[PDB]
Design a protein around this ligand. Structure first.
Ligand SMILES: Cc1cc2c3c(c1C)C(C)(C)CC=[N+]3c1c([nH]c(=O)[nH]c1=O)N2C[C@H](O)[C@H](O)[C@H](O)COP(=O)(O)O
Ligand SMILES: Cc1cc2c3c(c1C)C(C)(C)CC=[N+]3c1c([nH]c(=O)[nH]c1=O)N2C[C@H](O)[C@H](O)[C@H](O)COP(=O)(O)O
Ligand SMILES: [Mn+2]
Ligand SMILES: [Mn+2]
Ligand code: NA
Ligand code: NA
Lengths: 452, 454
């Protein structure tokens, strides 16, 4: 239950019967995403064997099911956030140095075609996206002053066969490396089709891996041995050796061009706007490459939740007794709604739980508290707790004129109202709140023919 | 700037002119506390050279001025909470093992009179206190199962020459050790060590979440002295005595053996209910030569014990969740427990409200939180009143939390349940001229000849 590269992942899923093979030709324009969308969240990923008759198939839906990611590493969905955090803890304490290897030993260097981005089966995802996007690509970039690596993930729109437009949010480390090159232009690699270890490294936030620190070793914790890197053609750049595809890239500061729209976590479009142009100097491919794309939605909600929930749980359980679990729900875009599950020990702690949760995660708009006997990850069950347990008069806590996330239109200019729901039963516990229960039953113990 | 025992402290204060010597005879009944009360909070402690013509003087007022405690360790008042926290951090990381020493080497074992508590100049403090109290005594008690030490501070009322009645709050570690003695058929032995240096006081006052039940917090004291904490076998011998104490009482207490104690002052400023609470019997008494009896006046002495230990953790927790936090005060007006003022440098609208959430979440006893800017003195209630008068928006700046957990001693929170309220007394952001405070030139008074009254 360790994985060197995406091949390992796909074979494991194929073997486990968690792969949906779409054998028919599909169009990269809208149709592909449309099919993915009908499968979003189920316990399987989707391999498209034939995209506009490309030789390169595309994989989508790797991240939309915690059960699936858990199956790849032998952990239950519920234990995955702790699993990932424990591994990032081990990396902080004893990092694994990368392994630099010779160009002709690096599977990704198998081929180097003339740079033609339009030959790649890059999907146009949502119906109003400003073009085809690579959105599962991990950027590796060296500090122009200190050569220290930074690993981030960023959306790149294809303009033409050799140009991408990239979105770099404010205070991103890639942004800061560009500021340094602009005291001299910035080279880097874009590594598409990487294993979850690289993905989690890329997505690890600033306060876990500072600017002056190399987060890429996080990936080493999800594979035997160290992360394999290789000198690019550049040579100011470093390439991920076990990537399916890798693009050597260069970008000048103060050189902007219209990119977007694209889906944001909110489920709304980004504003099309002048953002940095990046020019693709070279292209490397394994033989038998699969192109890896992410469907905006649960794939992104789980990336954020799996990395963020353990810290949040740690911060709340430290300030409040009886905390069991914290969910950054998919309904809340893995960012705007937290459900906190606790075992009450005294009246009043449920309200402290609301304060602690809002204090620990500034983007949150809603917090809901529920008891140990409600499934915090089932929105039906939280709705039920709201319907039978919430006192609307004393259990709704509203915070005005506070800081929040500017992308969410409930928070214009990072400012608005937050609301907590205390959907706990009354304490001390009373019979009128004891839920009915059906005997738990192993279905494998019976012969059951289900449809035919 | 290290201190082995209380002698070191008193000499340092005497040398520094931070000692008030009351040379006249005073009565331990009410009069002594009455005099202390007139001096509460000033930059000096009070040594009573003559209490009912006892040979033993009493020291009071060691903890009521952060400036004074700072002077003892060479730190400014403002840096004292961090000073203490850093030292407790070093102890958590690399504890110093205690040094056991021979009875005739232990200064406290100099004398062992027959047990007469009424021969000690133990003050009756507040006018309705149910008797004389020792309230600066640090209890050292060994786990009856595992022998692991626990250091706590607890009020003991004198009943007669050989009996005390003690108050043990719910979930105290001494409470848990007493459960073990009774669950094991023996009662609980321990020592009561009076006249200890601040390092022992801070060990005693260190809460459960810093030093769990299964952990020996007494090494914290080693961080405020050269070398390790000196202990010594008592006469018991289930007990361990602090060698450098001024006075130490070997004590035994049986579970389910209650007797009326109280009233006594609580941090709230109100009396505890007189009620059946555990009787403890004083088996033996040890004294240094030249012993001074150490008492605490309820009030600022207690507010500062709690604030000095609690503020750095609270600041750490809030500055981690909110940008631009500068300082947090557990104010004396709020009994060092119920009001926190948070000072910040605003960087964007809305963070002041998150500061309220973070502060209430980090310190459950709190009833009020007030936020103010860098240009308001968070420790001056006049200045925070001013921020309230000119900056608070009463409509949008008052945040009320209902039906939440709080501290049961505070009568705003019957049964550890009630309403909390936060005041956002910050200026508007972005900063505007209409909120720029006037300023007078800073001026050295020593640069001028000034005759101030005759
Ligand atoms: C999981 C994830 C994270 C995206 C992301 C997406 C996903 C799926 C997409 C591909 C669906 C949409 C685009 N994304 C962007 C993004 N950050 C950014 O500045 N611009 C982006 O366009 N991020 C987050 C970014 O990579 C993280 O904040 C890293 O922690 C940044 O690394 P750093 O801390 O070293 O700056
Ligand atoms: C600073 C301080 C703390 C008092 C205290 C006082 C002071 C000055 C007095 C002397 C003014 C009034 C009495 N006090 C009592 C008390 N705890 C308790 O259970 N009963 C008390 O009577 N405490 C608190 C107690 O000592 C601390 O909570 C310790 O951290 C307990 O240690 P533990 O966690 O090891 O049990
Ligand atoms: Mn980084
Ligand atoms: Mn303890
Ligand atoms: Na990162
Ligand atoms: Na203690």
């Amino acid at each position: 239950h360790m994985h060197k590269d995406l091949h390992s992942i796909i074979d494991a899923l194929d073997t486990a019967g968690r792969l949906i093979r779409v054998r028919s030709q599909v169009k990269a324009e809208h149709e592909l995403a449309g099919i993915a969308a009908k499968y979003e969240g189920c316990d399987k990923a989707v391999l498209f064997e034939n995209v506009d008759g490309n030789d390169i198939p595309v994989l989508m839906g790797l991240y939309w099911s915690r059960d699936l990611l858990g199956s790849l590493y032998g952990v239950d969905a519920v234990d995955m956030p702790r699993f990932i955090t424990s591994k990032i803890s081990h990396w902080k304490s004893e990092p694994t140095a990368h392994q630099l290897i010779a160009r002709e030993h690096a599977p990704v260097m198998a081929h180097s075609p003339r740079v033609d981005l339009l030959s790649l089966p890059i999907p146009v995802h949502a119906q109003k996206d400003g073009g085809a996007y690579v959105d599962a690509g991990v950027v590796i970039a060296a500090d122009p002053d200190t050569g220290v690596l930074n690993t981030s993930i960023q959306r790149f729109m294809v303009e033409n066969e050799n140009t991408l437009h990239v979105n770099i949010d404010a205070g991103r480390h890639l942004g800061a490396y560009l500021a340094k090159a602009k005291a001299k232009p910035l080279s880097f690699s874009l590594n598409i089709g990487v294993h979850p270890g690289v993905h989690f490294a890329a997505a690890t936030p600033s306060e876990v891996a500072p600017l002056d620190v190399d987060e890429l070793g996080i990936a080493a914790e999800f594979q035997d041995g160290p992360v394999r890197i290789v000198q690019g053609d550049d040579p100011r750049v470093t390439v991920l050796a076990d990537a399916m595809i890798s693009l050597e890239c260069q970008m000048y500061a103060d050189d902007l061009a219209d990119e977007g729209p694209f889906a944001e976590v909110t489920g709304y479009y980004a504003e099309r706007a002048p953002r940095p142009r990046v020019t693709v100097t070279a292209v490397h491919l394994q033989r038998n490459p699969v192109f890896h794309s992410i469907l905006s939605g649960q794939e992104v909600f789980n990336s954020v939740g799996l990395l963020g929930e353990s810290a949040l749980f740690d911060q709340v359980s430290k300030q409040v007794p009886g905390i069991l679990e914290v969910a950054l729900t998919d309904g809340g875009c893995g960012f705007y709604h937290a459900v906190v599950q606790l075992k009450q020990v005294r009246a009043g702690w449920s309200k402290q739980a609301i304060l602690a949760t809002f204090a620990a995660f500034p983007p949150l708009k809603m917090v809901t508290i529920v008891d140990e006997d409600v499934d915090l990850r089932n929105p039906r069950d939280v709705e039920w707790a709201m319907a039978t347990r919430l006192d609307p008069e004393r259990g709704i806590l509203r915070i005005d004129d506070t800081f929040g996330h500017g992308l969410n239109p409930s928070f214009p200019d990072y400012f608005g109202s937050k609301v907590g729901f205390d959907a706990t039963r009354s304490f001390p516990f009373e019979e009128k709140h004891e839920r009915i229960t059906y005997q738990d039953v192993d279905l494998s113990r019976f012969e059951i023919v289900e449809g035919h």
